[PDB]
C-alpha cells in the first residue's frame, strides 16, 4: 500500500494484522527515539532499530502500530494510513537535520529492504547497551543487527538480537 498526504512526503505502508512502515537513516545516533513511541495522540506498538551490512552498511527503523489500540486517534483523522504516515513523517523530520538524513520508504523500496534483510544466529542478548559496535565484528558475509523497544509500562524496555549469514 501507499499514500501521499496533506503533509510533505510520500509514505509506503504495509498491512497484514496491523500496519507496518519503515524509515531509512544514514557515527552513533541518539538512542532517545523511545519517546516517539508515545506521540501526542497515537500509541505505537514497537520501535525496532534495524541494521544490515558486511560494506553495504544499511540502517533502518521499522515501526509497528495497531489501529485498534489507536482508534481514538484515527477517528479524528481522515485515514488510518494518513495517521501513521503523519506519525512517521514526524519521526523522519525529528531525525532529519543532523549528518544523518531520514525519509519514509516507498513500499517498492520496502520490498527492496526486505530482500536486502534476507539476502537469501547466536543467542538473544540480555545486556546489550555496550555490545552493538563489537557485535558487528564477527566475520560473516552478511550480518543483520536489530534492537527492539516496547511499552512494557509507562517506560520503554529494550531487547536486541542478531543473526549471521
Amino acid at each position: 500500500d501507499h499514500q501521499r498526504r496533506f503533509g510533505h512526503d510520500v509514505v509506503g505502508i504495509r498491512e497484514y494484522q496491523g500496519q507496518l512502515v519503515a524509515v531509512v537513516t544514514v557515527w552513533l545516533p541518539v538512542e532517545a527515539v523511545a519517546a516517539r513511541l508515545r506521540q501526542f495522540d497515537v500509541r505505537l506498538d514497537a520501535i525496532d532499530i534495524v541494521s544490515v551490512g558486511t560494506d553495504e552498511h544499511h540502517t533502518w527503523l521499522v515501526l509497528r502500530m495497531d489501529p485498534q489500540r489507536n482508534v481514538a486517534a484515527v477517528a479524528a483523522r481522515d485515514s488510518v494510513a494518513a495517521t501513521l504516515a503523519a506519525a512517521t513523517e514526524r519521526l523522519a523530520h525529528d531525525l532529519n537535520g543532523r549528518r544523518w538524513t531520514a525519509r519514509p520508504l516507498t513500499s517498492s523500496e520496502i520490498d527492496d529492504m526486505d530482500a536486502t534483510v534476507l539476502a537469501g544466529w547466536v543467542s538473544p542478548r540480555d545486556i546489550t547497551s555496550e555490545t552493538l559496535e563489537r557485535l558487528w565484528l564477527p566475520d560473516t558475509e552478511a550480518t543483520a543487527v536489530t534492537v527492539r523497544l516496547r511499552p512494557r509500562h509507562g517506560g520503554v524496555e529494550v531487547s536486541a538480537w542478531v543473526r549471521y549469514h
Binding site: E15, F40, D41, Q68, V74, V80, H153
Partner: protein, 462 residues
C-alpha cells in the same frame, strides 16, 4: 528552563508546538494565534476569525478552559498533552426576570427539563410488553415445573410466534429510525417464550432434558440474530454464553450421570479459561462481517464527519465498537456463571466445605487481576462486581440454611468489612498509586492463585 512540547489543535488542523512551560497563558495566547493563522494561510486553509464579541482561549481536549492568569505548570499541562484553541463566544446578556411565581415556575421547568414524547412513549410500551411477556413465559415455566400439563406449551408457542412476527414486521417496515430498538426489545422478549415452549414439549417430569433443550434452542436463536440483525449484541453474547454453559451441563446430565459438584467445578474451570481467552475471542468475533447498523458512539461520530480514506476509519471504528461490545457481553456472562457455580458449590453442611472457599478466594483475586488490567470502565466494573458477588453469594448460601449465630456473625462481618477494604484501596491510597514492582508482585500473587485451581479441580471432580 522547562518547556512543554504539546500538539495544539485549531480549525481542523493539529500542530505540534514547543511552549514555555511556565509563562502564563495570557502571555503566549496571542502570538500562538498569529503562528497558527500563518500556518493555516500557508496551507491554503481559511484562518481563524473572531466571531463578534468574545475571547480567544485554550482548552484541554476534554473541553475545560485553561486559567489565563496561570502558567501551564501549576495547571498540570505536561509535555505530550494536547490543547484545543477556541474563540469563546461572549456569555453575558440581560438577566431576565419573571415576577409572577407561577409563570416563572412554568417557564423554568419547561426550559430546563424534557417532557414526555411519543418517541419515548413507544419505547416505554415496548419495555412494558417485554416485561409482561417474560412474566408470562416464566409463569408458564413455573406451572410446567409444578404440574405435568402439556397444555402450557401451545400457549407459550402462540405468544412467542405472535410477538416474533410483530417484531419482524416492525424491524422490516420501521427500520428507518434508531427507534428500531423497539423491535430489538420485542425480539429479545419473544425468544424466551419460544424457548420455554420448546422446553415444555419434553415429556415426563421436568428436569435436565427440558433445561438442555430450552437453553440450547434459546442460544441457537441468539446466535442466529447475530447474523441476521447484528444489533444490540452484548446482551445476546452474554445470553449465548449462559446457554452454552447450560447446554454443556444438560448434555453432561443426560449422556452421563455426573454429580452437580463435578459439573460446577467443570464450569468454573471453563470460566477461568474463558476469562483468559475472552479478549482474543472478542478480537476474532470483531470480524464476522455481520450487518452494519452503527451504534450510538459510531452514529454520533458519523454525524460530525462526512484501507484508505473514510471507509477505512469507518470500518476501523465499527470493528472496534463491535469488539468492545462482544467483550463486555462475554465478561458479564462469565461473571454470572462464576457466581452461580461458586454459589452452587459452597453448601455449608458438607464435609469438604473448606475447599471451595479457597476456590472462591483464588477466583476473587484472579478476577481482580483482570479488573485492574482491562481498560473499559464497564468491564473493570463488571469484573469487580462479579468478584464481590462471589463473596456475597457464598456468604448467604452458608448463613441462610446454616442456622447458627456463629456463621451469621462471620458472614455479616466480612460482608461489611470486605467492600470497605475494596473502597479503601482507592479512597485513601493516593490516586491508587503503587510502585510498578509492587503492582507486578500483586499480579504475581493473584496469578499464583490460578495454578492451585487445577489440582483442586481434579480433587473436587474426584
Amino acid at each position: 528552563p522547562q518547556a512543554a512540547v504539546v500538539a495544539i489543535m485549531a480549525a481542523d488542523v493539529q500542530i505540534a508546538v514547543v511552549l514555555d512551560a511556565h509563562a502564563p497563558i495570557s502571555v503566549m495566547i496571542d502570538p500562538l494565534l498569529k503562528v497558527v493563522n500563518t500556518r493555516l494561510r500557508e496551507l491554503g486553509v481559511a484562518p481563524l476569525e473572531a466571531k463578534g464579541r468574545g475571547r480567544w482561549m485554550l482548552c484541554l481536549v476534554d473541553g475545560t478552559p485553561l486559567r489565563p492568569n496561570l502558567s501551564l505548570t501549576e495547571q498540570e499541562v505536561y509535555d505530550g498533552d494536547r490543547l484545543w484553541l477556541k474563540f469563546l463566544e461572549d456569555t453575558e446578556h440581560r438577566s431576565e426576570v419573571i415576577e409572577h411565581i407561577s409563570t416563572a415556575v412554568a417557564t423554568n421547568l419547561s426550559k430546563r427539563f424534557a417532557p414526555i414524547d411519543p418517541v419515548v412513549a413507544v419505547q416505554v410500551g415496548a419495555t412494558m410488553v417485554a416485561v409482561g411477556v417474560l412474566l408470562g413465559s416464566a409463569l408458564l415455566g413455573w406451572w410446567r415445573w409444578q404440574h405435568e400439563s402439556w397444555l402450557p406449551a401451545p400457549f407459550a408457542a402462540v405468544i412467542a410466534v405472535l410477538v416474533l412476527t410483530v417484531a419482524t414486521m416492525i424491524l422490516a417496515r420501521s427500520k428507518t429510525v434508531p427507534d428500531r430498538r423497539v423491535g430489538d426489545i420485542l425480539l429479545l422478549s419473544g425468544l424466551v417464550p419460544l424457548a420455554v415452549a420448546i422446553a415444555a414439549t419434553a415429556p415426563g417430569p421436568v428436569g435436565a432434558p427440558h433445561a438442555v433443550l430450552g437453553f440450547g434452542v434459546f442460544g441457537v436463536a441468539a446466535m442466529l440474530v447475530m447474523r441476521f440483525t447484528g444489533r444490540r449484541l452484548g446482551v445476546y453474547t452474554a445470553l449465548v454464553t449462559l446457554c452454552a454453559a447450560a447446554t454443556a451441563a444438560g448434555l453432561a446430565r443426560m449422556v452421563l450421570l455426573t454429580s452437580a459438584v463435578t459439573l460446577l467445578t467443570c464450569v468454573l474451570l471453563a470460566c477461568v479459561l474463558m476469562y483468559h481467552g475472552a479478549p482474543a475471542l472478542s478480537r476474532w468475533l470483531s470480524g464476522i462481517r455481520l450487518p452494519v447498523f452503527p451504534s450510538a458512539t459510531s452514529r454520533w461520530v458519523f454525524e460530525a464527519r462526512p484501507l484508505e480514506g473514510p471507509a477505512s476509519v469507518r470500518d476501523v471504528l465499527l470493528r472496534a465498537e463491535r469488539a468492545r461490545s462482544f467483550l463486555t457481553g462475554l465478561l458479564v456472562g462469565l461473571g454470572v456463571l462464576t457466581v452461580v457455580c461458586l454459589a452452587g458449590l459452597c453448601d455449608p453442611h458438607a464435609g469438604r466445605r473448606w475447599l471451595p472457599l479457597l476456590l472462591a478466594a483464588f477466583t476473587f483475586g484472579f478476577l481482580i487481576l483482570r479488573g485492574r488490567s482491562y481498560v473499559d470502565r464497564w468491564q473493570a466494573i463488571t469484573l469487580a462486581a462479579t468478584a464481590v458477588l462471589i463473596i456475597a453469594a457464598v456468604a448467604v448460601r452458608y448463613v441462610l440454611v446454616s442456622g447458627s449465630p456463629a456463621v451469621l456473625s462471620a458472614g455479616v462481618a466480612v460482608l461489611v468489612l470486605l467492600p470497605a477494604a475494596g473502597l479503601t484501596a482507592a479512597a485513601v491510597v493516593p490516586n491508587t498509586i503503587y510502585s510498578p514492582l509492587f503492582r507486578k508482585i500483586v499480579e504475581w500473587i493473584e496469578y499464583l492463585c490460578l495454578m492451585p485451581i487445577f489440582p483442586l479441580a481434579l480433587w473436587l471432580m474426584n
